[PDB]
Every structure is written in C-alpha cells, then in structure tokens.
Amino acid sequence: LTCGQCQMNFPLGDILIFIEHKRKQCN
Ligand SMILES: [Zn+2]
C-alpha cells in the first residue's frame, strides 16, 4: 500500500504495516 502522509510504497503482503502507520504513527 502507498500513503501520501508517509509518502512510502509497499509490495503486496505488507498491508499490515500500512494499518499500523495509520494507527498511531499517521496521527
Ligand atoms: Zn501515513
């Protein structure tokens, strides 16, 4: 997944990381 806030791209199977960032790291 890719998030503009963190401006980073992730390959398939790494969606878990995206959720964590948007959890408490993406405020
Ligand atoms: Zn983010």
Length of the chain: 27
What's the burial of 3, exposed, middle or buried (CB within 10 Å: 0-12/13-18/19+)?
A: middle
Annotated binding site for Zn(2+): 3, 6, 21, 26
Half-sphere exposure for 13 (CA within 13 Å, toward CB): 0
Ligand 1 centroid from CA 11, angstroms: 15
Q: How many domains does the chain have?
A: 1
Instruction: Print the domain residue range for 4.
Output: 1-27
Q: Which residues, including other chains, have CB under 8 Å from residue 26's CB and lie 6 or more apart?
A: 3, 5, 6
